[PDB]
């Protein structure tokens, strides 16, 4: 790895600077190196990894969707298809890289429910991103579904219904159900039960945790308002 | 466009 | 060049798709390949080149300024300096690349005042970007000043005071004077004379050209409001 | 922050 000669602590520090600078490709490269040191990631460091790749693949996804729509319009020279494939291939590479970090060996070394759920959610997310562009598609969908489901099983056993990672997990699993798995009823069922069970637990929370949970509840709210 | 956890 | 195997027309087409996708690094790479085909760039294609590198170096510049401020605060480990240098070096590389396209051979093959002024303005801009991070600085400032001045000489002879490239040229030369050359009076003098002479020429313009010119006049306006 | 032609 190109980051193998840098100290773990220096990589984490520079990942934070990269975030402040909105240099998310640098951020991801630094966090990739941090992961490959072989030591667990703290909660803060898990968020750094997630935010970094969210922004990198996010730009790829938005670019892909622009190109894919233009491509479809021109089917109602090869350059539009060629460039969509270029972005698509670069997007799949990023997803394969994140999934490699998780399988080697973040998930197996996650000796916590909190840490393990976080990584399993990430596994579902980046198989979901591969499914968005897949046309093996069925097999990718099952990999995401399975990663999401195991995270759900653990989260329900080990974490309260207001935990932000659990809420973010159910949010994204509901989106998977709605737009990837062709299961809009599952998506609705999941979003509302998650919302309702979180609201019934808010009375147990501090003003700060309250803010954390209600911020993700708003996203469940907006989706249900769109789907029903 | 629906929200995922990475869009808040 | 990695783009040497692609048709000029395909590179231009994909540069346009890249813009729609907000993939500006791709855009610049495509336009770099287009330039290296050795044929002149149309007005539209000159704008594609300029917008592409504006966005790439723009992100580098904003990141540099974030890092440089953090670095200065910590002087009121080496990681902040190290990463600022990483971004700085990558920024200088981009500026060197644009300046190489101009010197080999966009400027000498520009057989128009319109085309030649455009490229000379670009030369001033990217030497200005090198000056922003330079600490050889005097020599870079003279290179920008000289490129800007020759563009001004041509523009005054060959183009009306409302021409958008001429207005954009004077705008950026005024900024050079204000924040790079320590000449805030030159900057003010240049911005107001450009503004005033453009306003006195607006009566000659179509509704469309009017819009073009007044859009850059607003920027001269905002700067004068800041400086006086 | 002042405007340059690349900020309109
Ligand atoms: N450097 C970063 N980006 C983060 C660092 C930490 C952290 C710091 C210290 C201890 C533990 C964690 C984060 C915790 N996570 C959030 O605060 C959060 C995440 C997603 C989200 C919102 C907020 C609002 C809507 O969507 S984020
Ligand atoms: N058990 C809890 N409730 C938490 C414990 C900690 C923690 C752990 C170790 C060190 C410091 C803090 C949390 C930090 N906060 C987040 O990670 C966070 C917050 C908001 C949010 C997201 C993530 C995703 C979307 O919105 S939360
Ligand atoms: N297929 C379903 N389950 C639904 C069917 C209907 C309905 C029934 C009759 C008339 C019109 C609509 C629903 C109404 N909308 C909600 O109940 C709702 C509930 C909780 C919640 C949000 C929205 C957002 C935040 O959390 S939901
Ligand atoms: N693909 C692009 N980005 C462009 C393509 C063309 C073009 C197309 C056909 C013929 C000639 C030129 C452009 C002309 N230039 C502008 O319209 C322009 C430039 C800077 C600016 C504003 C407007 C508003 C504020 O700052 S831009
Ligand atoms: N002689 C003129 N006045 C123009 C002639 C042409 C042209 C030439 C060949 C083909 C098609 C059009 C123009 C296209 N427009 C621009 O290039 C433009 C417009 C607004 C603007 C900027 C640039 C920079 C900031 O704001 S302008
Ligand atoms: N050092 C100078 N040249 C100036 C000194 C003063 C001044 C004098 C007395 C009291 C307060 C201020 C100026 C006033 N401001 C303008 O005249 C002005 C003119 C044209 C214009 C804009 C602004 C923006 C768009 O185009 S300018
Ligand atoms: Cl391509
Ligand atoms: Cl570095
Ligand atoms: Mg129903
Ligand atoms: Mg004065």
Coordinates of C-alpha atoms and ligand atoms in Angstrom, one line a residue:
Chain A
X1 CA 0.0 0.0 0.0
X2 CA 1.1 3.5 -0.8
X3 CA 0.2 4.5 2.8
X4 CA 2.2 1.6 4.4
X5 CA 5.1 3.8 5.3
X6 CA 3.0 6.4 7.2
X7 CA 2.2 6.0 10.9
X8 CA -1.4 5.0 11.8
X9 CA -1.8 8.2 13.9
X10 CA -0.5 10.4 11.0
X11 CA -3.0 8.8 8.6
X12 CA -5.9 9.4 11.0
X13 CA -4.8 13.0 11.5
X14 CA -4.5 13.6 7.8
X15 CA -7.9 12.0 7.2
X16 CA -9.3 14.6 9.5
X17 CA -7.5 17.5 7.7
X18 CA -8.7 16.1 4.3
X19 CA -12.3 16.2 5.6
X20 CA -11.9 19.8 6.6
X21 CA -10.4 20.5 3.2
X22 CA -13.2 18.5 1.4
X23 CA -10.5 16.4 -0.2
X24 CA -12.5 13.2 0.2
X25 CA -10.5 11.0 -2.2
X26 CA -7.5 11.8 -0.1
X27 CA -9.6 11.1 3.0
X28 CA -10.5 7.7 1.7
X29 CA -6.9 6.9 0.8
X30 CA -5.7 7.8 4.2
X31 CA -8.5 5.8 5.9
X32 CA -7.8 2.8 3.7
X33 CA -4.2 2.9 4.9
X34 CA -5.4 3.3 8.5
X35 CA -7.5 0.1 8.1
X36 CA -4.7 -1.9 6.6
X37 CA -2.5 -1.3 9.7
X38 CA -4.6 -4.2 11.1
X39 CA -5.9 -2.5 14.3
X40 CA -9.5 -1.8 15.1
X41 CA -11.1 1.5 14.2
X42 CA -12.7 3.5 17.0
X43 CA -16.2 4.9 16.6
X44 CA -14.9 8.2 15.4
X45 CA -12.5 6.4 13.0
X46 CA -15.4 4.3 11.7
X47 CA -17.3 7.4 10.9
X48 CA -14.2 8.9 9.2
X49 CA -13.9 5.7 7.0
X50 CA -17.7 5.9 6.2
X51 CA -17.8 9.6 5.4
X52 CA -14.8 9.4 3.2
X53 CA -16.1 6.6 0.9
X54 CA -19.6 8.0 1.1
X55 CA -18.4 11.2 -0.6
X56 CA -16.2 9.4 -3.2
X57 CA -18.8 6.9 -4.3
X58 CA -21.5 9.6 -4.0
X59 CA -19.9 11.7 -6.7
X60 CA -19.5 8.6 -8.9
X61 CA -23.1 7.6 -8.4
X62 CA -24.4 11.0 -9.2
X63 CA -22.2 11.1 -12.3
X64 CA -23.3 7.6 -13.3
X65 CA -27.0 8.6 -13.1
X66 CA -26.4 11.7 -15.2
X67 CA -24.7 9.6 -17.9
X68 CA -27.1 6.7 -17.7
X69 CA -30.1 9.1 -18.3
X70 CA -28.3 10.7 -21.3
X71 CA -27.5 7.3 -22.6
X72 CA -31.1 6.2 -22.4
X73 CA -32.3 9.3 -24.1
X74 CA -30.0 8.6 -27.1
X75 CA -31.7 5.2 -27.4
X76 CA -35.4 6.4 -27.5
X77 CA -21.8 7.1 -31.6
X78 CA -20.3 5.0 -28.8
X79 CA -19.0 7.9 -26.7
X80 CA -21.9 8.1 -24.2
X81 CA -21.8 4.4 -23.5
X82 CA -18.0 4.4 -23.4
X83 CA -17.9 7.1 -20.8
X84 CA -20.7 5.7 -18.7
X85 CA -18.7 2.4 -18.6
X86 CA -15.6 4.4 -17.5
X87 CA -17.4 5.9 -14.6
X88 CA -19.2 2.7 -13.8
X89 CA -16.0 0.7 -13.8
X90 CA -14.3 3.3 -11.5
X91 CA -17.4 3.1 -9.2
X92 CA -17.3 -0.7 -9.1
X93 CA -13.6 -0.5 -8.2
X94 CA -14.3 1.7 -5.2
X95 CA -17.1 -0.6 -4.0
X96 CA -14.8 -3.6 -4.4
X97 CA -12.1 -1.8 -2.4
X98 CA -14.4 -1.0 0.5
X99 CA -15.8 -4.5 0.4
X100 CA -12.2 -5.9 0.6
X101 CA -11.4 -3.9 3.7
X102 CA -14.6 -5.2 5.3
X103 CA -13.9 -8.8 4.4
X104 CA -10.1 -8.5 5.1
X105 CA -10.6 -8.2 8.0
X106 CA -12.7 -5.5 9.6
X107 CA -15.8 -7.6 10.1
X108 CA -14.1 -10.7 11.5
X109 CA -12.0 -8.6 13.9
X110 CA -15.0 -6.6 15.1
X111 CA -15.5 -8.0 18.6
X112 CA -18.4 -5.7 19.4
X113 CA -22.0 -5.5 18.3
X114 CA -21.6 -1.7 17.8
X115 CA -18.5 -2.3 15.6
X116 CA -19.8 -5.4 13.8
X117 CA -23.2 -3.8 13.0
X118 CA -21.5 -0.7 11.6
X119 CA -19.4 -2.8 9.2
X120 CA -22.2 -5.1 8.2
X121 CA -24.3 -2.0 7.4
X122 CA -21.4 -0.8 5.2
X123 CA -21.3 -4.2 3.4
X124 CA -25.0 -3.9 2.6
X125 CA -24.5 -0.3 1.4
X126 CA -21.7 -1.0 -1.0
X127 CA -23.3 -4.2 -2.4
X128 CA -26.3 -2.0 -2.8
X129 CA -24.2 0.5 -4.8
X130 CA -23.0 -2.4 -7.0
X131 CA -26.6 -3.5 -7.6
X132 CA -27.6 0.0 -8.7
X133 CA -25.4 -0.4 -11.8
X134 CA -25.6 -4.2 -12.2
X135 CA -27.3 -5.7 -15.2
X136 CA -24.9 -11.2 -11.5
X137 CA -27.4 -8.6 -10.4
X138 CA -29.5 -11.1 -8.5
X139 CA -26.5 -12.4 -6.7
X140 CA -25.4 -8.9 -5.7
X141 CA -28.9 -8.2 -4.3
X142 CA -28.7 -11.3 -2.2
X143 CA -25.3 -10.3 -0.8
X144 CA -26.7 -6.9 0.2
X145 CA -29.9 -8.3 1.6
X146 CA -27.9 -10.9 3.7
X147 CA -25.4 -8.3 5.0
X148 CA -28.3 -6.0 6.0
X149 CA -30.3 -8.7 7.6
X150 CA -27.5 -9.9 9.9
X151 CA -26.8 -6.4 10.9
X152 CA -30.5 -6.0 11.7
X153 CA -30.5 -9.3 13.8
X154 CA -27.5 -8.1 15.9
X155 CA -28.9 -4.5 16.2
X156 CA -32.3 -5.7 17.5
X157 CA -30.6 -7.9 20.1
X158 CA -27.8 -5.6 21.3
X159 CA -28.8 -2.0 20.7
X160 CA -31.8 0.3 21.7
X161 CA -34.2 1.3 18.9
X162 CA -32.9 4.9 19.1
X163 CA -29.2 4.0 18.4
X164 CA -28.2 6.1 15.4
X165 CA -26.3 3.3 13.7
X166 CA -29.3 1.0 14.1
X167 CA -31.6 3.8 12.7
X168 CA -29.2 4.5 9.8
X169 CA -29.1 0.7 9.2
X170 CA -32.9 0.4 9.0
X171 CA -33.1 3.6 6.8
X172 CA -30.8 2.2 4.2
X173 CA -32.3 -1.3 4.3
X174 CA -35.6 0.2 3.7
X175 CA -34.2 2.1 0.7
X176 CA -32.7 -1.2 -0.5
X177 CA -36.1 -2.9 -0.3
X178 CA -37.8 0.0 -2.1
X179 CA -35.6 0.7 -5.1
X180 CA -33.3 -2.3 -5.4
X181 CA -35.4 -5.4 -4.3
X182 CA -38.7 -4.2 -5.8
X183 CA -40.3 -4.6 -2.4
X184 CA -41.9 -1.2 -1.6
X185 CA -44.2 -2.8 1.0
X186 CA -41.2 -4.2 2.9
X187 CA -39.6 -0.8 2.6
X188 CA -42.7 0.9 4.1
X189 CA -43.1 -1.7 6.8
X190 CA -39.5 -1.3 7.9
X191 CA -39.4 2.5 7.8
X192 CA -42.6 2.9 9.9
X193 CA -41.8 0.2 12.5
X194 CA -38.3 1.7 12.9
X195 CA -39.7 5.2 13.2
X196 CA -42.5 4.2 15.6
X197 CA -40.2 2.1 17.9
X198 CA -37.7 4.9 18.0
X199 CA -40.3 7.6 19.0
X200 CA -41.5 5.4 21.8
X201 CA -37.9 5.2 23.2
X202 CA -37.0 8.9 23.0
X203 CA -38.2 9.5 26.6
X204 CA -35.1 7.6 27.8
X205 CA -32.6 9.8 26.0
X206 CA -30.5 12.9 26.9
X207 CA -31.0 16.1 25.0
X208 CA -27.9 15.2 22.9
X209 CA -28.9 11.6 22.1
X210 CA -32.4 12.9 21.3
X211 CA -31.0 15.2 18.7
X212 CA -28.9 12.3 17.2
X213 CA -32.0 10.0 16.9
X214 CA -34.5 12.6 15.7
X215 CA -32.1 13.6 12.9
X216 CA -32.3 10.1 11.4
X217 CA -36.0 9.8 12.2
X218 CA -36.6 12.8 10.0
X219 CA -35.1 10.9 7.1
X220 CA -37.4 7.9 7.7
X221 CA -40.2 10.5 7.8
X222 CA -39.3 12.0 4.5
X223 CA -39.2 8.6 2.8
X224 CA -42.5 7.4 4.2
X225 CA -44.0 10.7 3.0
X226 CA -42.7 10.0 -0.5
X227 CA -43.8 6.3 -0.6
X228 CA -47.3 6.5 0.9
Chain B
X1 CA -35.1 11.7 -4.2
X2 CA -35.4 9.4 -1.2
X3 CA -32.9 9.8 1.6
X4 CA -30.2 7.3 2.7
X5 CA -28.2 7.6 5.9
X6 CA -25.4 9.1 3.8
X7 CA -27.6 12.1 2.7
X8 CA -28.8 13.7 5.9
Chain C
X1 CA -0.7 10.9 -23.8
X2 CA -3.3 8.5 -22.4
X3 CA -5.9 10.3 -24.7
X4 CA -3.8 10.0 -27.8
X5 CA -5.8 7.0 -29.1
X6 CA -9.2 8.8 -28.9
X7 CA -10.6 10.9 -31.7
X8 CA -10.6 14.7 -31.2
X9 CA -14.3 14.8 -31.7
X10 CA -14.9 12.0 -29.1
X11 CA -12.7 13.9 -26.6
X12 CA -14.7 17.1 -27.1
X13 CA -18.0 15.1 -26.8
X14 CA -16.9 13.4 -23.6
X15 CA -15.6 16.7 -22.1
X16 CA -19.1 18.0 -22.5
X17 CA -20.6 14.9 -20.8
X18 CA -18.0 15.2 -18.0
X19 CA -19.2 18.8 -17.4
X20 CA -22.8 17.7 -17.2
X21 CA -21.7 15.0 -14.8
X22 CA -19.6 17.5 -12.8
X23 CA -16.6 15.2 -13.4
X24 CA -14.1 18.1 -13.9
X25 CA -10.9 16.1 -13.5
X26 CA -12.2 13.9 -16.4
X27 CA -13.2 17.0 -18.2
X28 CA -9.7 18.5 -18.0
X29 CA -8.1 15.2 -19.0
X30 CA -10.3 15.1 -22.1
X31 CA -9.6 18.7 -23.0
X32 CA -5.9 18.2 -22.4
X33 CA -6.0 15.4 -25.0
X34 CA -8.1 17.6 -27.4
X35 CA -5.4 20.3 -27.2
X36 CA -2.6 17.9 -27.8
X37 CA -4.2 16.9 -31.2
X38 CA -2.5 20.1 -32.5
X39 CA -5.6 21.8 -33.9
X40 CA -7.0 25.1 -32.7
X41 CA -9.8 25.2 -30.2
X42 CA -13.1 26.9 -31.1
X43 CA -14.5 29.6 -28.8
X44 CA -16.8 26.9 -27.2
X45 CA -13.8 24.6 -26.9
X46 CA -11.7 27.3 -25.3
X47 CA -14.4 27.7 -22.7
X48 CA -14.5 24.0 -22.1
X49 CA -10.7 23.9 -21.5
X50 CA -11.0 26.9 -19.1
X51 CA -14.0 25.7 -17.1
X52 CA -12.4 22.3 -16.7
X53 CA -9.2 23.5 -15.2
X54 CA -10.9 26.3 -13.3
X55 CA -12.8 23.7 -11.3
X56 CA -9.9 21.3 -10.8
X57 CA -7.5 24.0 -9.6
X58 CA -10.3 25.7 -7.7
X59 CA -10.8 22.7 -5.5
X60 CA -7.0 22.5 -4.9
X61 CA -6.8 26.2 -4.1
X62 CA -9.7 26.0 -1.6
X63 CA -8.1 23.0 0.0
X64 CA -4.7 24.7 0.1
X65 CA -6.2 27.7 1.9
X66 CA -7.9 25.6 4.5
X67 CA -4.7 23.7 5.2
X68 CA -2.5 26.8 5.2
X69 CA -4.7 28.5 7.8
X70 CA -4.6 25.4 10.0
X71 CA -0.8 25.3 9.6
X72 CA -0.5 28.9 10.5
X73 CA -2.6 28.4 13.6
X74 CA -0.4 25.6 14.8
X75 CA 2.5 28.1 14.6
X76 CA 1.0 30.8 16.8
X77 CA 4.0 17.2 14.4
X78 CA 4.8 17.5 10.7
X79 CA 1.5 16.2 9.4
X80 CA -0.2 19.5 8.7
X81 CA 2.9 20.8 6.8
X82 CA 3.3 17.5 5.0
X83 CA -0.3 17.4 3.7
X84 CA -0.3 21.1 2.7
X85 CA 2.8 20.4 0.7
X86 CA 1.1 17.4 -0.9
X87 CA -1.9 19.5 -2.0
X88 CA 0.5 22.4 -3.0
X89 CA 2.6 20.1 -5.1
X90 CA -0.5 18.7 -6.8
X91 CA -1.7 22.2 -7.5
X92 CA 1.6 23.3 -8.9
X93 CA 1.5 20.3 -11.2
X94 CA -1.8 21.3 -12.6
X95 CA -0.7 24.8 -13.2
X96 CA 2.5 23.6 -14.9
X97 CA 0.3 21.3 -17.1
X98 CA -2.0 24.2 -18.2
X99 CA 1.0 26.5 -18.8
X100 CA 2.6 23.7 -20.9
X101 CA -0.4 23.5 -23.2
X102 CA -0.4 27.3 -23.6
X103 CA 3.4 27.4 -24.4
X104 CA 3.3 24.3 -26.5
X105 CA 1.6 25.5 -28.6
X106 CA -1.8 27.1 -28.1
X107 CA -0.5 30.7 -27.8
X108 CA 1.8 30.7 -30.8
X109 CA -0.8 29.0 -33.0
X110 CA -3.6 31.5 -32.0
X111 CA -3.9 33.5 -35.2
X112 CA -6.7 35.7 -33.7
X113 CA -6.8 38.4 -31.2
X114 CA -9.9 36.7 -29.7
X115 CA -8.1 33.4 -29.4
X116 CA -4.7 34.9 -28.4
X117 CA -6.2 37.1 -25.7
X118 CA -8.1 34.2 -24.2
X119 CA -4.9 32.1 -23.9
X120 CA -2.7 35.0 -22.6
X121 CA -5.4 35.6 -19.9
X122 CA -5.2 31.9 -19.0
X123 CA -1.4 32.3 -18.7
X124 CA -1.7 35.1 -16.3
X125 CA -4.3 33.2 -14.3
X126 CA -2.2 30.1 -13.8
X127 CA 1.0 32.0 -13.0
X128 CA -1.2 33.9 -10.5
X129 CA -2.2 30.6 -9.0
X130 CA 1.4 29.6 -8.7
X131 CA 2.2 32.9 -7.0
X132 CA -0.6 32.3 -4.4
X133 CA 1.5 29.5 -3.0
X134 CA 5.0 30.7 -3.9
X135 CA 7.5 31.6 -1.2
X136 CA 11.0 32.4 -7.2
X137 CA 7.8 34.2 -6.1
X138 CA 9.0 37.6 -7.6
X139 CA 9.7 35.8 -10.9
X140 CA 6.3 34.2 -11.0
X141 CA 4.6 37.5 -10.3
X142 CA 6.4 39.1 -13.3
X143 CA 5.4 36.2 -15.5
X144 CA 1.8 36.7 -14.6
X145 CA 2.0 40.5 -14.9
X146 CA 3.6 40.2 -18.3
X147 CA 1.1 37.7 -19.7
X148 CA -1.8 39.9 -18.4
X149 CA -0.3 43.1 -19.8
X150 CA 0.1 41.7 -23.3
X151 CA -3.4 40.4 -23.3
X152 CA -4.6 43.9 -22.2
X153 CA -2.6 45.6 -25.0
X154 CA -4.2 43.3 -27.6
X155 CA -7.7 43.5 -26.1
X156 CA -7.7 47.3 -26.1
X157 CA -6.6 47.4 -29.7
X158 CA -8.8 44.7 -31.1
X159 CA -11.9 44.2 -28.9
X160 CA -14.7 46.5 -27.7
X161 CA -14.7 47.4 -24.0
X162 CA -17.8 45.2 -23.4
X163 CA -16.3 42.0 -24.8
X164 CA -16.7 39.4 -22.1
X165 CA -13.2 38.0 -22.4
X166 CA -11.7 41.5 -22.2
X167 CA -13.9 42.2 -19.1
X168 CA -12.9 38.9 -17.5
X169 CA -9.3 39.7 -18.3
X170 CA -9.4 43.1 -16.6
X171 CA -11.3 41.6 -13.7
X172 CA -8.6 39.0 -13.0
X173 CA -5.7 41.4 -13.7
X174 CA -7.3 43.7 -11.1
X175 CA -7.4 40.9 -8.6
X176 CA -3.7 40.1 -9.4
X177 CA -2.9 43.7 -8.7
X178 CA -4.8 43.7 -5.4
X179 CA -3.8 40.5 -3.7
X180 CA -0.7 39.3 -5.4
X181 CA 1.3 42.4 -6.5
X182 CA 0.5 44.6 -3.4
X183 CA -1.0 47.3 -5.7
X184 CA -4.5 48.0 -4.4
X185 CA -4.5 51.3 -6.2
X186 CA -3.7 49.8 -9.5
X187 CA -6.5 47.2 -8.8
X188 CA -9.0 49.9 -8.1
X189 CA -8.0 52.1 -11.1
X190 CA -8.3 49.1 -13.4
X191 CA -11.6 47.8 -12.1
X192 CA -13.3 51.2 -12.3
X193 CA -12.0 52.3 -15.7
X194 CA -13.0 48.9 -17.0
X195 CA -16.4 49.2 -15.5
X196 CA -17.0 52.8 -16.6
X197 CA -15.9 52.2 -20.2
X198 CA -18.1 49.1 -20.4
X199 CA -21.1 50.9 -19.2
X200 CA -20.6 53.6 -21.8
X201 CA -20.6 51.0 -24.5
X202 CA -23.7 49.0 -23.4
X203 CA -26.0 51.1 -25.7
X204 CA -24.3 49.3 -28.7
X205 CA -25.3 45.8 -27.6
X206 CA -28.1 43.3 -28.2
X207 CA -30.2 42.1 -25.3
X208 CA -28.0 39.0 -25.2
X209 CA -24.6 40.7 -25.3
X210 CA -25.9 43.1 -22.7
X211 CA -26.5 40.2 -20.4
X212 CA -23.0 38.8 -21.0
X213 CA -21.3 42.1 -20.3
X214 CA -23.4 43.1 -17.3
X215 CA -22.8 39.7 -15.7
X216 CA -19.0 40.5 -15.5
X217 CA -19.6 44.1 -14.7
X218 CA -21.4 42.9 -11.5
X219 CA -18.1 41.2 -10.5
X220 CA -16.1 44.4 -11.0
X221 CA -18.8 46.1 -9.0
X222 CA -18.6 43.7 -6.0
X223 CA -14.8 44.0 -5.9
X224 CA -14.8 47.8 -6.0
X225 CA -17.4 47.8 -3.2
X226 CA -15.0 45.6 -1.2
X227 CA -11.9 47.7 -1.9
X228 CA -13.2 51.2 -1.5
Chain D
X1 CA -13.9 37.1 -0.8
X2 CA -13.3 39.1 -4.0
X3 CA -14.5 37.7 -7.3
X4 CA -12.3 36.5 -10.2
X5 CA -13.8 35.7 -13.6
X6 CA -13.9 32.0 -12.6
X7 CA -16.3 32.6 -9.7
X8 CA -19.3 34.4 -11.3
Ligands
LIG1 N1 -15.4 13.5 11.4 C1 -16.6 13.1 11.3 N2 -17.3 13.3 10.0 C2 -17.3 12.5 12.5 C3 -16.6 12.2 13.7 C4 -17.6 11.6 14.7 C5 -17.2 11.2 16.1 C6 -16.3 12.0 16.8 C7 -16.0 11.7 18.1 C8 -16.5 10.5 18.7 C9 -17.3 9.7 18.0 C10 -17.7 10.0 16.7 C11 -18.9 11.5 14.1 C12 -20.1 10.9 14.8 N3 -21.1 10.9 13.8 C13 -21.9 12.1 13.6 O1 -21.7 13.0 14.3 C14 -22.9 12.2 12.5 C15 -22.8 11.2 11.5 C16 -23.8 11.2 10.5 C17 -24.7 12.3 10.4 C18 -24.7 13.3 11.4 C19 -23.7 13.2 12.4 C20 -25.7 14.3 11.0 C21 -26.5 13.7 9.9 O2 -25.7 12.5 9.4 S1 -18.9 12.0 12.5
LIG2 N1 -24.3 4.7 21.8 C1 -24.4 5.9 21.2 N2 -25.8 6.4 21.0 C2 -23.2 6.6 20.8 C3 -21.9 6.5 21.4 C4 -20.9 7.4 20.7 C5 -19.4 7.5 21.0 C6 -18.7 6.3 21.1 C7 -17.3 6.4 21.4 C8 -16.7 7.7 21.5 C9 -17.5 8.8 21.4 C10 -18.9 8.7 21.1 C11 -21.6 8.1 19.6 C12 -20.9 9.1 18.7 N3 -22.0 9.5 17.7 C13 -22.1 8.8 16.5 O1 -21.4 8.0 16.2 C14 -23.3 9.2 15.6 C15 -24.1 10.3 16.0 C16 -25.1 10.7 15.1 C17 -25.3 10.0 13.9 C18 -24.5 9.0 13.5 C19 -23.5 8.6 14.4 C20 -25.0 8.5 12.2 C21 -26.1 9.3 11.8 O2 -26.4 10.2 12.9 S1 -23.2 7.7 19.5
LIG3 N1 -49.0 1.8 3.6 C1 -49.0 2.5 4.9 N2 -48.4 2.0 5.9 C2 -49.7 3.8 5.0 C3 -51.0 4.1 4.4 C4 -51.4 5.5 4.9 C5 -52.7 6.2 4.5 C6 -53.9 5.6 4.8 C7 -55.1 6.3 4.5 C8 -55.0 7.4 3.7 C9 -53.8 8.0 3.4 C10 -52.7 7.3 3.7 C11 -50.4 6.1 5.7 C12 -50.5 7.5 6.3 N3 -49.1 7.9 6.6 C13 -48.6 7.5 7.9 O1 -49.2 6.9 8.6 C14 -47.2 7.9 8.4 C15 -47.0 7.2 9.6 C16 -45.8 7.4 10.3 C17 -44.8 8.2 9.8 C18 -45.0 8.9 8.6 C19 -46.2 8.7 7.8 C20 -43.8 9.6 8.4 C21 -43.1 9.6 9.6 O2 -43.5 8.5 10.4 S1 -49.2 5.0 6.0
LIG4 N1 -19.7 24.4 -21.8 C1 -19.5 25.6 -21.3 N2 -19.2 25.7 -19.9 C2 -19.6 26.8 -22.2 C3 -19.8 26.7 -23.6 C4 -19.8 28.0 -24.2 C5 -20.1 28.3 -25.7 C6 -21.0 27.5 -26.4 C7 -21.2 27.8 -27.7 C8 -20.5 28.8 -28.4 C9 -19.6 29.5 -27.7 C10 -19.3 29.3 -26.4 C11 -19.6 29.0 -23.2 C12 -19.6 30.5 -23.5 N3 -19.3 31.1 -22.2 C13 -20.4 31.3 -21.3 O1 -21.5 31.1 -21.6 C14 -20.1 31.8 -19.9 C15 -18.8 31.8 -19.4 C16 -18.4 32.2 -18.2 C17 -19.5 32.7 -17.3 C18 -20.8 32.7 -17.8 C19 -21.1 32.2 -19.1 C20 -21.7 33.2 -16.7 C21 -20.7 33.7 -15.6 O2 -19.4 33.2 -15.9 S1 -19.4 28.3 -21.7
LIG5 N1 -17.8 38.5 -29.5 C1 -18.5 38.2 -28.6 N2 -19.1 39.1 -27.7 C2 -18.8 36.7 -28.5 C3 -18.8 35.8 -29.6 C4 -19.2 34.4 -29.1 C5 -19.2 33.1 -30.0 C6 -18.1 32.9 -30.9 C7 -18.2 31.7 -31.7 C8 -19.3 30.9 -31.6 C9 -20.3 31.2 -30.8 C10 -20.3 32.3 -30.0 C11 -19.4 34.4 -27.7 C12 -19.9 33.2 -26.9 N3 -19.9 33.6 -25.5 C13 -18.8 33.6 -24.7 O1 -17.8 33.1 -25.1 C14 -18.9 34.1 -23.3 C15 -20.1 34.7 -22.9 C16 -20.2 35.2 -21.6 C17 -19.1 35.2 -20.7 C18 -17.9 34.6 -21.1 C19 -17.8 34.1 -22.4 C20 -16.9 34.7 -20.0 C21 -17.6 35.3 -18.9 O2 -19.0 35.6 -19.3 S1 -19.3 35.9 -27.1
LIG6 N1 -10.4 55.1 -4.6 C1 -11.6 55.3 -5.4 N2 -11.5 55.3 -6.7 C2 -12.9 55.6 -4.8 C3 -13.1 56.5 -3.6 C4 -14.6 56.6 -3.3 C5 -15.2 57.3 -2.1 C6 -15.0 58.7 -2.1 C7 -15.6 59.5 -1.1 C8 -16.3 58.8 -0.1 C9 -16.4 57.4 -0.1 C10 -15.9 56.7 -1.2 C11 -15.3 55.8 -4.2 C12 -16.8 55.6 -4.2 N3 -17.2 54.4 -4.9 C13 -17.3 54.4 -6.3 O1 -17.1 55.5 -6.9 C14 -17.7 53.3 -7.3 C15 -17.6 53.7 -8.6 C16 -17.9 52.9 -9.6 C17 -18.3 51.6 -9.4 C18 -18.3 51.1 -8.0 C19 -18.1 52.0 -6.9 C20 -18.7 49.7 -8.1 C21 -19.2 49.5 -9.5 O2 -18.6 50.5 -10.3 S1 -14.3 55.1 -5.4
LIG7 CL1 -14.3 7.2 -22.0
LIG8 CL1 0.7 13.8 3.2
LIG9 MG1 -50.1 -1.7 2.0
LIG10 MG1 -6.8 56.5 -4.0

